[PDB]
Design a protein around this ligand. Sequence first.
Ligand SMILES: CC[C@H](C)CN(C[C@@H](O)[C@H](Cc1ccccc1)NC(=O)O[C@H]1CO[C@H]2OCC[C@H]21)S(=O)(=O)c1ccc(OC)cc1
Lengths: 99, 99
Amino acid sequence: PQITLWKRPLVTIKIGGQLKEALLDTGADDTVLEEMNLPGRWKPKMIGGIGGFIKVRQYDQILIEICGHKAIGTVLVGPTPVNIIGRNLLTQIGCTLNF
Amino acid sequence: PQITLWKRPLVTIKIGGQLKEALLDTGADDTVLEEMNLPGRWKPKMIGGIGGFIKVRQYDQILIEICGHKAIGTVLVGPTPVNIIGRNLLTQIGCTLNF
Ligand SMILES: CC[C@H](C)CN(C[C@@H](O)[C@H](Cc1ccccc1)NC(=O)O[C@H]1CO[C@H]2OCC[C@H]21)S(=O)(=O)c1ccc(OC)cc1
């Protein structure tokens, strides 16, 4: 589809058997999800933006379905105020900026 | 143009007669630029990112050129890690997401 930017580009995603709303974020190198209890091993990480840094847990090879498009890659989980789909997964679903 | 997301969507912008590099950021409601001198009046404002809130200078109705596309709107100037172009200006240049 085509998504305009009048409002926040929120879309439904499916991860770990749960449906969630997430932001298609071309400014996010990586995908950062709100706190959730995923299984498997993880590695600590810190990511920075406006306001400073937050601590997150890096999970690798996590399947996410974004508007019916399947993608698999690294997913960070931490105290983010918003679910954020980053470029690592946006590429896998063929997402592009256009103007 | 059509922009894939395998690399950061960085572009050259023109503001206040100066050229700069900025990130097209669909996850940003507003445009936030690094510290710089801009002509005209400004009023203090606060914005929140993933790491907390920062103090910024709000410049209204600022002319800014993004890849030869003109925009006029609000520009926030503060300690952001990166020059980011938010939806307030991406809409002015007709920017959409497509997959
Ligand atoms: C360094 C580039 C940019 C600041 C990075 N951010 C993605 C943004 O899209 C962020 C994503 C975001 C969106 C809402 C709340 C927290 C973060 N939005 C944002 O900060 O926008 C601010 C400016 O306009 C306002 O509108 C929203 C907040 C304000 S981020 O959230 O901090 C981030 C996301 C993934 C990362 O992986 C390495 C690293 C950093």
